[PDB]
Amino acid sequence: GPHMATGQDRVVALVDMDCFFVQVEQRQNPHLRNKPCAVVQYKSWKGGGIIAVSYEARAFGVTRSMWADDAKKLCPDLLLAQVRESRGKANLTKYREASVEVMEIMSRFAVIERASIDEAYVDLTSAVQERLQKLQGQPISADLLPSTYIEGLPQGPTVQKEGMRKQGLFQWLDSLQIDNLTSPDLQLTVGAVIVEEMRAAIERETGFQCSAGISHNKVLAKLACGLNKPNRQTLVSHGSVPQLFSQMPIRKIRSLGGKLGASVIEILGIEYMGELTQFTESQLQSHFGEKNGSWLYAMCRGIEHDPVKPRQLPKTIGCSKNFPGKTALATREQVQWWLLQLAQELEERLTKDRNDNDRVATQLVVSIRVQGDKRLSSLRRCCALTRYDAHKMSHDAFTVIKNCNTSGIQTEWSPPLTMLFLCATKFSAS
DNA sequence: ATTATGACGCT
DNA sequence: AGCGTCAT
Ligand SMILES: Nc1nc2c(ncn2[C@H]2C[C@H](O)[C@@H](COP(=O)(O)NP(=O)(O)OP(=O)(O)O)O2)c(=O)[nH]1
Ligand SMILES: [Mg+2]
Ligand SMILES: [Mg+2]
């Protein structure tokens, strides 16, 4: 009753760039704009592997993870941009720099948590309180929400998508009690006004379009963001959760798309997030552990407490390359040369990071995969990172991995290596 | 031969 | 510390 917390204390937004790498390439090359196009890494094997797809190309069935040759079968006029190659490997610098452009704009409005190269959470609670004081009980005009959808509306008592959007928005705004400065629905609405402004700023100052979700916590904001992509934002209220979750496959919620989500489905004999409400917190904890159980009990009611962390910069800086099938590294000279290539890219990125961000990494993590292992990493070993020198980093990585070499011969490497990975971690202020 | 990352939980 | 999971 009156003591049952409803998880309506915060206003949280999730901003995700639409087809990011594609937009970066379309800004640089206007010939790619408003066209079916995709971004690929490498080229020789099946035309390269697609990692980003414009919405025009998605209409033909083009997806991430698809080989470009296969994509061309679905979309013969598909245009392709290739990721830059440096020191024999894909180099993603252009997209990391474009990311910084966007994240610095977002940081003007509120503290953000960088969740990936193209998305960030925003805690708008305080900004919303400020705007509400400025409004002075003035109603919110639909003109202030020109790209906002209200999930679950319209309802009750009409052909085109924009007319649907506007009808739902008008139903929402008509039911708003702008008198109450602590109404959660009002707070969400003001949050959506601020996010319209943030997205306008991003597009004006970078040329990039994005989508966004506005809700009371990170998981609902993330889910909302995907409901109306591209170039739109969606508000998911606390009240919309029962209907939304009643037909929501468990796998659609962040964290449940893998083995745990499959176990929830299999053990409980359910399919949708809303079915979880029928179990007690102790029941869920008994199946999925104390932490997962409490999280599921709250999440199926729309409640989640994970804070937006004040963290605009990545916590690690890493360099990885796969060596599939017959390109695996089977000599010591090979392994040394590629450790050096990775280490040289890492040195360049670390030196730039130190100059920009006033910090130094102190730990080097070396991960490898050996032929036959189906795991991402076969082995992971750390050593100290005391100088930004690629030859030293690569020599140290070799020293910590050289005992994996089964070959009695000194020149050969067996079993051959199918992946190398260097990761700088444990940053300190400098 | 699905690649290149990044975050975070467990023990 | 080293390994596993999840995202994409
Ligand atoms: N290297 C690499 N980059 C990837 C991979 N997957 C994604 N990226 C890169 C390329 C992506 O552009 C970028 C952002 O990932 P999203 O937000 O998941 N996809 P997007 O922004 O394209 O479309 P949407 O409009 O649906 O949000 O991350 C991968 O497997 N490998
Ligand atoms: Mg995106
Ligand atoms: Mg994203």
Side-chain angles (χ1 to χ4, degrees), chain A residues 40-50 67-68 81-86 88-91 320-322 338:
Chain A
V40 293
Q41 59 199 357
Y42 304 119
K43 199 95 217 174
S44 299
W45 183 270
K46 296 175 176 286
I50 288 174
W67 296 115
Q82 330 180 225
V83 175
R84 152 177 207 180
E85 283 170 71
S86 304
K89 69 179 291 295
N91 180 291
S320 171
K321 185 170 173 47
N322 287 0
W338 281 108

PDB file of all heavy atoms in Angstrom, chain A residues 40-50 67-68 81-86 88-91 320-322 338, chain B residues 1 3-5:
ATOM      1  N   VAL A  40      31.985  -2.429 -42.929  1.00  0.00           N
ATOM      2  CA  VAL A  40      32.567  -3.765 -42.944  1.00  0.00           C
ATOM      3  C   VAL A  40      33.975  -3.693 -42.372  1.00  0.00           C
ATOM      4  O   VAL A  40      34.657  -2.669 -42.478  1.00  0.00           O
ATOM      5  CB  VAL A  40      32.591  -4.343 -44.379  1.00  0.00           C
ATOM      6  CG1 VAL A  40      31.187  -4.597 -44.889  1.00  0.00           C
ATOM      7  CG2 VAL A  40      33.379  -3.441 -45.321  1.00  0.00           C
ATOM      8  N   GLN A  41      34.431  -4.775 -41.760  1.00  0.00           N
ATOM      9  CA  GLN A  41      35.856  -4.841 -41.475  1.00  0.00           C
ATOM     10  C   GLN A  41      36.493  -5.985 -42.258  1.00  0.00           C
ATOM     11  O   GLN A  41      35.937  -7.087 -42.335  1.00  0.00           O
ATOM     12  CB  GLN A  41      36.129  -4.819 -39.948  1.00  0.00           C
ATOM     13  CG  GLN A  41      35.554  -5.863 -39.086  1.00  0.00           C
ATOM     14  CD  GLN A  41      35.511  -5.450 -37.576  1.00  0.00           C
ATOM     15  OE1 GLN A  41      35.962  -4.370 -37.127  1.00  0.00           O
ATOM     16  NE2 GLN A  41      34.934  -6.324 -36.811  1.00  0.00           N
ATOM     17  N   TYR A  42      37.628  -5.660 -42.904  1.00  0.00           N
ATOM     18  CA  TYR A  42      38.381  -6.528 -43.820  1.00  0.00           C
ATOM     19  C   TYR A  42      37.604  -6.716 -45.118  1.00  0.00           C
ATOM     20  O   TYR A  42      36.556  -6.089 -45.300  1.00  0.00           O
ATOM     21  CB  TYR A  42      38.711  -7.856 -43.148  1.00  0.00           C
ATOM     22  CG  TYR A  42      39.475  -7.661 -41.844  1.00  0.00           C
ATOM     23  CD1 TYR A  42      38.947  -8.102 -40.652  1.00  0.00           C
ATOM     24  CD2 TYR A  42      40.656  -6.931 -41.806  1.00  0.00           C
ATOM     25  CE1 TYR A  42      39.616  -7.904 -39.439  1.00  0.00           C
ATOM     26  CE2 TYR A  42      41.339  -6.727 -40.603  1.00  0.00           C
ATOM     27  CZ  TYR A  42      40.809  -7.226 -39.430  1.00  0.00           C
ATOM     28  OH  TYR A  42      41.469  -7.028 -38.234  1.00  0.00           O
ATOM     29  N   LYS A  43      38.110  -7.550 -46.030  1.00  0.00           N
ATOM     30  CA  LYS A  43      37.531  -7.592 -47.372  1.00  0.00           C
ATOM     31  C   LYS A  43      37.726  -8.929 -48.074  1.00  0.00           C
ATOM     32  O   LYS A  43      36.847  -9.365 -48.828  1.00  0.00           O
ATOM     33  CB  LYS A  43      38.138  -6.478 -48.229  1.00  0.00           C
ATOM     34  CG  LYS A  43      37.343  -6.108 -49.476  1.00  0.00           C
ATOM     35  CD  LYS A  43      36.420  -4.916 -49.201  1.00  0.00           C
ATOM     36  CE  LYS A  43      35.079  -5.029 -49.929  1.00  0.00           C
ATOM     37  NZ  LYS A  43      34.155  -3.930 -49.511  1.00  0.00           N
ATOM     38  N   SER A  44      38.872  -9.581 -47.865  1.00  0.00           N
ATOM     39  CA  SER A  44      39.215 -10.734 -48.696  1.00  0.00           C
ATOM     40  C   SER A  44      38.271 -11.905 -48.463  1.00  0.00           C
ATOM     41  O   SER A  44      37.818 -12.544 -49.421  1.00  0.00           O
ATOM     42  CB  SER A  44      40.669 -11.144 -48.458  1.00  0.00           C
ATOM     43  OG  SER A  44      41.534 -10.079 -48.814  1.00  0.00           O
ATOM     44  N   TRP A  45      37.963 -12.208 -47.205  1.00  0.00           N
ATOM     45  CA  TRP A  45      37.105 -13.341 -46.868  1.00  0.00           C
ATOM     46  C   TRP A  45      35.642 -12.919 -46.944  1.00  0.00           C
ATOM     47  O   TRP A  45      35.156 -12.169 -46.082  1.00  0.00           O
ATOM     48  CB  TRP A  45      37.437 -13.871 -45.478  1.00  0.00           C
ATOM     49  CG  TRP A  45      36.642 -15.093 -45.100  1.00  0.00           C
ATOM     50  CD1 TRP A  45      35.435 -15.123 -44.470  1.00  0.00           C
ATOM     51  CD2 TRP A  45      37.035 -16.458 -45.278  1.00  0.00           C
ATOM     52  NE1 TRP A  45      35.032 -16.423 -44.272  1.00  0.00           N
ATOM     53  CE2 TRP A  45      36.002 -17.262 -44.751  1.00  0.00           C
ATOM     54  CE3 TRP A  45      38.159 -17.080 -45.830  1.00  0.00           C
ATOM     55  CZ2 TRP A  45      36.054 -18.656 -44.771  1.00  0.00           C
ATOM     56  CZ3 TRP A  45      38.213 -18.470 -45.847  1.00  0.00           C
ATOM     57  CH2 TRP A  45      37.164 -19.240 -45.320  1.00  0.00           C
ATOM     58  N   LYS A  46      34.946 -13.419 -47.975  1.00  0.00           N
ATOM     59  CA  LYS A  46      33.514 -13.208 -48.209  1.00  0.00           C
ATOM     60  C   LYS A  46      33.128 -11.727 -48.229  1.00  0.00           C
ATOM     61  O   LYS A  46      31.990 -11.367 -47.906  1.00  0.00           O
ATOM     62  CB  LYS A  46      32.669 -13.986 -47.191  1.00  0.00           C
ATOM     63  CG  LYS A  46      32.831 -15.502 -47.318  1.00  0.00           C
ATOM     64  CD  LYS A  46      32.089 -16.270 -46.231  1.00  0.00           C
ATOM     65  CE  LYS A  46      32.194 -17.782 -46.448  1.00  0.00           C
ATOM     66  NZ  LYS A  46      31.335 -18.243 -47.580  1.00  0.00           N
ATOM     67  N   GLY A  47      34.058 -10.855 -48.639  1.00  0.00           N
ATOM     68  CA  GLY A  47      33.781  -9.445 -48.773  1.00  0.00           C
ATOM     69  C   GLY A  47      33.886  -8.642 -47.494  1.00  0.00           C
ATOM     70  O   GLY A  47      33.627  -7.436 -47.524  1.00  0.00           O
ATOM     71  N   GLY A  48      34.276  -9.268 -46.381  1.00  0.00           N
ATOM     72  CA  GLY A  48      34.354  -8.624 -45.084  1.00  0.00           C
ATOM     73  C   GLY A  48      33.090  -8.809 -44.258  1.00  0.00           C
ATOM     74  O   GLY A  48      32.009  -9.072 -44.770  1.00  0.00           O
ATOM     75  N   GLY A  49      33.217  -8.589 -42.952  1.00  0.00           N
ATOM     76  CA  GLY A  49      32.117  -8.829 -42.024  1.00  0.00           C
ATOM     77  C   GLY A  49      31.417  -7.536 -41.640  1.00  0.00           C
ATOM     78  O   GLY A  49      32.060  -6.583 -41.195  1.00  0.00           O
ATOM     79  N   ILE A  50      30.090  -7.520 -41.795  1.00  0.00           N
ATOM     80  CA  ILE A  50      29.315  -6.298 -41.555  1.00  0.00           C
ATOM     81  C   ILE A  50      29.137  -6.059 -40.060  1.00  0.00           C
ATOM     82  O   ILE A  50      28.746  -6.967 -39.316  1.00  0.00           O
ATOM     83  CB  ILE A  50      27.951  -6.385 -42.251  1.00  0.00           C
ATOM     84  CG1 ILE A  50      28.137  -6.258 -43.758  1.00  0.00           C
ATOM     85  CG2 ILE A  50      27.029  -5.262 -41.761  1.00  0.00           C
ATOM     86  CD1 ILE A  50      26.856  -6.484 -44.516  1.00  0.00           C
ATOM     87  N   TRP A  67      28.207 -11.612 -43.793  1.00  0.00           N
ATOM     88  CA  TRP A  67      29.293 -11.351 -44.740  1.00  0.00           C
ATOM     89  C   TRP A  67      28.801 -10.414 -45.837  1.00  0.00           C
ATOM     90  O   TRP A  67      27.656 -10.525 -46.295  1.00  0.00           O
ATOM     91  CB  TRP A  67      29.776 -12.651 -45.376  1.00  0.00           C
ATOM     92  CG  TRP A  67      30.378 -13.573 -44.382  1.00  0.00           C
ATOM     93  CD1 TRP A  67      29.902 -14.801 -44.018  1.00  0.00           C
ATOM     94  CD2 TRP A  67      31.569 -13.358 -43.610  1.00  0.00           C
ATOM     95  NE1 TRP A  67      30.718 -15.357 -43.060  1.00  0.00           N
ATOM     96  CE2 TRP A  67      31.746 -14.491 -42.792  1.00  0.00           C
ATOM     97  CE3 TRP A  67      32.501 -12.315 -43.529  1.00  0.00           C
ATOM     98  CZ2 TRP A  67      32.818 -14.614 -41.906  1.00  0.00           C
ATOM     99  CZ3 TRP A  67      33.561 -12.441 -42.639  1.00  0.00           C
ATOM    100  CH2 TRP A  67      33.714 -13.586 -41.857  1.00  0.00           C
ATOM    101  N   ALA A  68      29.669  -9.487 -46.267  1.00  0.00           N
ATOM    102  CA  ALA A  68      29.243  -8.506 -47.266  1.00  0.00           C
ATOM    103  C   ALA A  68      28.784  -9.182 -48.555  1.00  0.00           C
ATOM    104  O   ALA A  68      27.847  -8.701 -49.200  1.00  0.00           O
ATOM    105  CB  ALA A  68      30.364  -7.503 -47.547  1.00  0.00           C
ATOM    106  N   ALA A  81      31.301   0.875 -46.683  1.00  0.00           N
ATOM    107  CA  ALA A  81      32.497   1.575 -46.218  1.00  0.00           C
ATOM    108  C   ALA A  81      33.305   0.616 -45.349  1.00  0.00           C
ATOM    109  O   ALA A  81      32.735  -0.105 -44.524  1.00  0.00           O
ATOM    110  CB  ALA A  81      32.148   2.853 -45.427  1.00  0.00           C
ATOM    111  N   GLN A  82      34.633   0.598 -45.531  1.00  0.00           N
ATOM    112  CA  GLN A  82      35.494  -0.306 -44.768  1.00  0.00           C
ATOM    113  C   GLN A  82      36.181   0.420 -43.620  1.00  0.00           C
ATOM    114  O   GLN A  82      36.623   1.563 -43.777  1.00  0.00           O
ATOM    115  CB  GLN A  82      36.583  -0.948 -45.627  1.00  0.00           C
ATOM    116  CG  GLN A  82      36.292  -1.182 -47.067  1.00  0.00           C
ATOM    117  CD  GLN A  82      37.491  -1.819 -47.733  1.00  0.00           C
ATOM    118  OE1 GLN A  82      37.889  -1.425 -48.826  1.00  0.00           O
ATOM    119  NE2 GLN A  82      38.100  -2.785 -47.050  1.00  0.00           N
ATOM    120  N   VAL A  83      36.242  -0.252 -42.461  1.00  0.00           N
ATOM    121  CA  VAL A  83      37.034   0.230 -41.334  1.00  0.00           C
ATOM    122  C   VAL A  83      38.499   0.345 -41.741  1.00  0.00           C
ATOM    123  O   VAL A  83      39.030  -0.499 -42.473  1.00  0.00           O
ATOM    124  CB  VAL A  83      36.867  -0.712 -40.128  1.00  0.00           C
ATOM    125  CG1 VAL A  83      37.756  -0.299 -38.993  1.00  0.00           C
ATOM    126  CG2 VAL A  83      35.387  -0.759 -39.673  1.00  0.00           C
ATOM    127  N   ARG A  84      39.155   1.394 -41.261  1.00  0.00           N
ATOM    128  CA  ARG A  84      40.570   1.595 -41.559  1.00  0.00           C
ATOM    129  C   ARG A  84      41.395   0.415 -41.045  1.00  0.00           C
ATOM    130  O   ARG A  84      41.049  -0.223 -40.046  1.00  0.00           O
ATOM    131  CB  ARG A  84      41.034   2.901 -40.918  1.00  0.00           C
ATOM    132  CG  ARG A  84      42.493   2.974 -40.530  1.00  0.00           C
ATOM    133  CD  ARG A  84      42.764   4.360 -39.988  1.00  0.00           C
ATOM    134  NE  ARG A  84      44.145   4.783 -40.164  1.00  0.00           N
ATOM    135  CZ  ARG A  84      44.608   5.963 -39.774  1.00  0.00           C
ATOM    136  NH1 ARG A  84      43.826   6.847 -39.176  1.00  0.00           N
ATOM    137  NH2 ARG A  84      45.883   6.272 -40.009  1.00  0.00           N
ATOM    138  N   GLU A  85      42.485   0.097 -41.759  1.00  0.00           N
ATOM    139  CA  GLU A  85      43.448  -0.910 -41.326  1.00  0.00           C
ATOM    140  C   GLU A  85      44.796  -0.262 -41.079  1.00  0.00           C
ATOM    141  O   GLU A  85      45.288   0.498 -41.918  1.00  0.00           O
ATOM    142  CB  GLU A  85      43.607  -2.057 -42.341  1.00  0.00           C
ATOM    143  CG  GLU A  85      42.469  -3.066 -42.324  1.00  0.00           C
ATOM    144  CD  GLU A  85      42.532  -4.042 -43.505  1.00  0.00           C
ATOM    145  OE1 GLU A  85      43.440  -4.912 -43.524  1.00  0.00           O
ATOM    146  OE2 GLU A  85      41.667  -3.946 -44.406  1.00  0.00           O
ATOM    147  N   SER A  86      45.383  -0.566 -39.915  1.00  0.00           N
ATOM    148  CA  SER A  86      46.698  -0.085 -39.523  1.00  0.00           C
ATOM    149  C   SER A  86      47.436  -1.206 -38.817  1.00  0.00           C
ATOM    150  O   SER A  86      46.842  -1.953 -38.031  1.00  0.00           O
ATOM    151  CB  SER A  86      46.618   1.127 -38.595  1.00  0.00           C
ATOM    152  OG  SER A  86      45.865   2.170 -39.191  1.00  0.00           O
ATOM    153  N   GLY A  88      48.273  -3.966 -39.852  1.00  0.00           N
ATOM    154  CA  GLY A  88      47.711  -5.261 -40.167  1.00  0.00           C
ATOM    155  C   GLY A  88      46.383  -5.587 -39.519  1.00  0.00           C
ATOM    156  O   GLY A  88      45.911  -6.725 -39.645  1.00  0.00           O
ATOM    157  N   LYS A  89      45.748  -4.630 -38.837  1.00  0.00           N
ATOM    158  CA  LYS A  89      44.525  -4.913 -38.105  1.00  0.00           C
ATOM    159  C   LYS A  89      43.534  -3.772 -38.292  1.00  0.00           C
ATOM    160  O   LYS A  89      43.906  -2.641 -38.603  1.00  0.00           O
ATOM    161  CB  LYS A  89      44.818  -5.144 -36.611  1.00  0.00           C
ATOM    162  CG  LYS A  89      45.263  -3.905 -35.818  1.00  0.00           C
ATOM    163  CD  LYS A  89      45.514  -4.250 -34.336  1.00  0.00           C
ATOM    164  CE  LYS A  89      44.203  -4.587 -33.626  1.00  0.00           C
ATOM    165  NZ  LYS A  89      43.300  -3.412 -33.575  1.00  0.00           N
ATOM    166  N   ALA A  90      42.268  -4.075 -38.037  1.00  0.00           N
ATOM    167  CA  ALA A  90      41.233  -3.044 -37.992  1.00  0.00           C
ATOM    168  C   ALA A  90      41.593  -1.979 -36.965  1.00  0.00           C
ATOM    169  O   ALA A  90      42.069  -2.294 -35.871  1.00  0.00           O
ATOM    170  CB  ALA A  90      39.894  -3.679 -37.629  1.00  0.00           C
ATOM    171  N   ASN A  91      41.367  -0.704 -37.304  1.00  0.00           N
ATOM    172  CA  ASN A  91      41.679   0.348 -36.345  1.00  0.00           C
ATOM    173  C   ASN A  91      40.451   1.245 -36.242  1.00  0.00           C
ATOM    174  O   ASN A  91      40.013   1.819 -37.248  1.00  0.00           O
ATOM    175  CB  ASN A  91      42.890   1.175 -36.768  1.00  0.00           C
ATOM    176  CG  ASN A  91      43.191   2.261 -35.774  1.00  0.00           C
ATOM    177  OD1 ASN A  91      42.457   3.219 -35.620  1.00  0.00           O
ATOM    178  ND2 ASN A  91      44.312   2.100 -35.079  1.00  0.00           N
ATOM    179  N   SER A 320      42.729  -6.105 -29.967  1.00  0.00           N
ATOM    180  CA  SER A 320      42.476  -7.533 -30.132  1.00  0.00           C
ATOM    181  C   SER A 320      42.527  -7.917 -31.609  1.00  0.00           C
ATOM    182  O   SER A 320      42.054  -7.150 -32.449  1.00  0.00           O
ATOM    183  CB  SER A 320      41.108  -7.861 -29.512  1.00  0.00           C
ATOM    184  OG  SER A 320      40.661  -9.166 -29.785  1.00  0.00           O
ATOM    185  N   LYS A 321      43.052  -9.106 -31.921  1.00  0.00           N
ATOM    186  CA  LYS A 321      42.950  -9.633 -33.278  1.00  0.00           C
ATOM    187  C   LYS A 321      42.786 -11.143 -33.266  1.00  0.00           C
ATOM    188  O   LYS A 321      43.523 -11.853 -32.567  1.00  0.00           O
ATOM    189  CB  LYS A 321      44.164  -9.257 -34.140  1.00  0.00           C
ATOM    190  CG  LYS A 321      43.944  -9.739 -35.601  1.00  0.00           C
ATOM    191  CD  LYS A 321      44.984  -9.188 -36.582  1.00  0.00           C
ATOM    192  CE  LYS A 321      44.841  -9.805 -37.987  1.00  0.00           C
ATOM    193  NZ  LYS A 321      43.433  -9.801 -38.448  1.00  0.00           N
ATOM    194  N   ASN A 322      41.815 -11.618 -34.040  1.00  0.00           N
ATOM    195  CA  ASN A 322      41.603 -13.034 -34.301  1.00  0.00           C
ATOM    196  C   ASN A 322      42.447 -13.506 -35.479  1.00  0.00           C
ATOM    197  O   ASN A 322      42.690 -12.764 -36.437  1.00  0.00           O
ATOM    198  CB  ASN A 322      40.141 -13.316 -34.639  1.00  0.00           C
ATOM    199  CG  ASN A 322      39.227 -13.231 -33.440  1.00  0.00           C
ATOM    200  OD1 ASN A 322      39.646 -12.959 -32.309  1.00  0.00           O
ATOM    201  ND2 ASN A 322      37.948 -13.469 -33.688  1.00  0.00           N
ATOM    202  N   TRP A 338      53.078 -10.017 -34.204  1.00  0.00           N
ATOM    203  CA  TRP A 338      51.714  -9.554 -33.958  1.00  0.00           C
ATOM    204  C   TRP A 338      51.562  -8.969 -32.550  1.00  0.00           C
ATOM    205  O   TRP A 338      50.831  -7.984 -32.359  1.00  0.00           O
ATOM    206  CB  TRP A 338      50.734 -10.695 -34.196  1.00  0.00           C
ATOM    207  CG  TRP A 338      50.452 -10.908 -35.665  1.00  0.00           C
ATOM    208  CD1 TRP A 338      50.879 -11.947 -36.444  1.00  0.00           C
ATOM    209  CD2 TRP A 338      49.711 -10.038 -36.529  1.00  0.00           C
ATOM    210  NE1 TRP A 338      50.435 -11.786 -37.737  1.00  0.00           N
ATOM    211  CE2 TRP A 338      49.717 -10.619 -37.817  1.00  0.00           C
ATOM    212  CE3 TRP A 338      49.043  -8.826 -36.337  1.00  0.00           C
ATOM    213  CZ2 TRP A 338      49.067 -10.032 -38.907  1.00  0.00           C
ATOM    214  CZ3 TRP A 338      48.402  -8.244 -37.418  1.00  0.00           C
ATOM    215  CH2 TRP A 338      48.422  -8.845 -38.691  1.00  0.00           C
TER     216      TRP A 338
ATOM    217  P    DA B   1      37.580 -21.108 -37.894  1.00  0.00           P
ATOM    218  OP1  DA B   1      36.408 -21.576 -37.056  1.00  0.00           O
ATOM    219  OP2  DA B   1      37.875 -21.971 -39.100  1.00  0.00           O
ATOM    220  O5'  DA B   1      37.244 -19.635 -38.441  1.00  0.00           O
ATOM    221  C5'  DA B   1      36.286 -18.828 -37.722  1.00  0.00           C
ATOM    222  C4'  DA B   1      35.473 -18.033 -38.712  1.00  0.00           C
ATOM    223  O4'  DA B   1      36.370 -17.349 -39.607  1.00  0.00           O
ATOM    224  C3'  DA B   1      34.548 -18.869 -39.591  1.00  0.00           C
ATOM    225  O3'  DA B   1      33.383 -18.121 -39.908  1.00  0.00           O
ATOM    226  C2'  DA B   1      35.393 -19.106 -40.832  1.00  0.00           C
ATOM    227  C1'  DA B   1      36.148 -17.797 -40.940  1.00  0.00           C
ATOM    228  N9   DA B   1      37.445 -17.921 -41.590  1.00  0.00           N
ATOM    229  C8   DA B   1      38.143 -19.057 -41.909  1.00  0.00           C
ATOM    230  N7   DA B   1      39.284 -18.813 -42.499  1.00  0.00           N
ATOM    231  C5   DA B   1      39.341 -17.430 -42.571  1.00  0.00           C
ATOM    232  C6   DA B   1      40.302 -16.552 -43.096  1.00  0.00           C
ATOM    233  N6   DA B   1      41.435 -16.952 -43.661  1.00  0.00           N
ATOM    234  N1   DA B   1      40.048 -15.227 -43.008  1.00  0.00           N
ATOM    235  C2   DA B   1      38.908 -14.829 -42.436  1.00  0.00           C
ATOM    236  N3   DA B   1      37.931 -15.560 -41.914  1.00  0.00           N
ATOM    237  C4   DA B   1      38.213 -16.868 -42.014  1.00  0.00           C
ATOM    238  P    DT B   3      36.100 -14.318 -37.068  1.00  0.00           P
ATOM    239  OP1  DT B   3      37.261 -14.553 -37.941  1.00  0.00           O
ATOM    240  OP2  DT B   3      35.920 -15.130 -35.844  1.00  0.00           O
ATOM    241  O5'  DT B   3      36.171 -12.766 -36.739  1.00  0.00           O
ATOM    242  C5'  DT B   3      36.095 -11.793 -37.791  1.00  0.00           C
ATOM    243  C4'  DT B   3      36.392 -10.419 -37.240  1.00  0.00           C
ATOM    244  O4'  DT B   3      35.217  -9.866 -36.614  1.00  0.00           O
ATOM    245  C3'  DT B   3      37.484 -10.374 -36.179  1.00  0.00           C
ATOM    246  O3'  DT B   3      38.142  -9.136 -36.385  1.00  0.00           O
ATOM    247  C2'  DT B   3      36.713 -10.327 -34.874  1.00  0.00           C
ATOM    248  C1'  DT B   3      35.485  -9.533 -35.264  1.00  0.00           C
ATOM    249  N1   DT B   3      34.274  -9.828 -34.492  1.00  0.00           N
ATOM    250  C2   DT B   3      33.467  -8.767 -34.164  1.00  0.00           C
ATOM    251  O2   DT B   3      33.718  -7.621 -34.487  1.00  0.00           O
ATOM    252  N3   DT B   3      32.333  -9.098 -33.485  1.00  0.00           N
ATOM    253  C4   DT B   3      31.941 -10.353 -33.094  1.00  0.00           C
ATOM    254  O4   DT B   3      30.895 -10.497 -32.472  1.00  0.00           O
ATOM    255  C5   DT B   3      32.824 -11.427 -33.474  1.00  0.00           C
ATOM    256  C7   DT B   3      32.494 -12.821 -33.043  1.00  0.00           C
ATOM    257  C6   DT B   3      33.941 -11.115 -34.139  1.00  0.00           C
ATOM    258  P    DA B   4      39.344  -8.742 -35.396  1.00  0.00           P
ATOM    259  OP1  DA B   4      40.388  -8.075 -36.210  1.00  0.00           O
ATOM    260  OP2  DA B   4      39.669  -9.897 -34.544  1.00  0.00           O
ATOM    261  O5'  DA B   4      38.699  -7.632 -34.460  1.00  0.00           O
ATOM    262  C5'  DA B   4      38.234  -6.418 -35.025  1.00  0.00           C
ATOM    263  C4'  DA B   4      37.835  -5.451 -33.936  1.00  0.00           C
ATOM    264  O4'  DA B   4      36.616  -5.922 -33.284  1.00  0.00           O
ATOM    265  C3'  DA B   4      38.870  -5.284 -32.837  1.00  0.00           C
ATOM    266  O3'  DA B   4      38.871  -3.932 -32.393  1.00  0.00           O
ATOM    267  C2'  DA B   4      38.376  -6.254 -31.752  1.00  0.00           C
ATOM    268  C1'  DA B   4      36.858  -6.166 -31.915  1.00  0.00           C
ATOM    269  N9   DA B   4      36.132  -7.383 -31.537  1.00  0.00           N
ATOM    270  C8   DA B   4      36.567  -8.676 -31.638  1.00  0.00           C
ATOM    271  N7   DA B   4      35.683  -9.569 -31.243  1.00  0.00           N
ATOM    272  C5   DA B   4      34.586  -8.807 -30.867  1.00  0.00           C
ATOM    273  C6   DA B   4      33.316  -9.150 -30.358  1.00  0.00           C
ATOM    274  N6   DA B   4      32.928 -10.412 -30.126  1.00  0.00           N
ATOM    275  N1   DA B   4      32.459  -8.142 -30.087  1.00  0.00           N
ATOM    276  C2   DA B   4      32.850  -6.881 -30.319  1.00  0.00           C
ATOM    277  N3   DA B   4      34.015  -6.438 -30.789  1.00  0.00           N
ATOM    278  C4   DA B   4      34.842  -7.458 -31.049  1.00  0.00           C
ATOM    279  P    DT B   5      40.025  -3.396 -31.415  1.00  0.00           P
ATOM    280  OP1  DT B   5      39.942  -1.914 -31.426  1.00  0.00           O
ATOM    281  OP2  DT B   5      41.308  -4.084 -31.709  1.00  0.00           O
ATOM    282  O5'  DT B   5      39.648  -4.053 -30.021  1.00  0.00           O
ATOM    283  C5'  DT B   5      39.291  -3.246 -28.914  1.00  0.00           C
ATOM    284  C4'  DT B   5      37.799  -3.246 -28.696  1.00  0.00           C
ATOM    285  O4'  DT B   5      37.241  -4.560 -28.873  1.00  0.00           O
ATOM    286  C3'  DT B   5      37.434  -2.857 -27.273  1.00  0.00           C
ATOM    287  O3'  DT B   5      37.239  -1.449 -27.262  1.00  0.00           O
ATOM    288  C2'  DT B   5      36.161  -3.639 -26.994  1.00  0.00           C
ATOM    289  C1'  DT B   5      36.010  -4.587 -28.178  1.00  0.00           C
ATOM    290  N1   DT B   5      35.711  -5.986 -27.834  1.00  0.00           N
ATOM    291  C2   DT B   5      34.448  -6.291 -27.382  1.00  0.00           C
ATOM    292  O2   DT B   5      33.578  -5.453 -27.218  1.00  0.00           O
ATOM    293  N3   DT B   5      34.242  -7.620 -27.115  1.00  0.00           N
ATOM    294  C4   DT B   5      35.147  -8.652 -27.265  1.00  0.00           C
ATOM    295  O4   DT B   5      34.816  -9.800 -26.990  1.00  0.00           O
ATOM    296  C5   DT B   5      36.448  -8.262 -27.752  1.00  0.00           C
ATOM    297  C7   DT B   5      37.494  -9.312 -27.948  1.00  0.00           C
ATOM    298  C6   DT B   5      36.661  -6.966 -28.014  1.00  0.00           C
TER     299       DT B   5
END
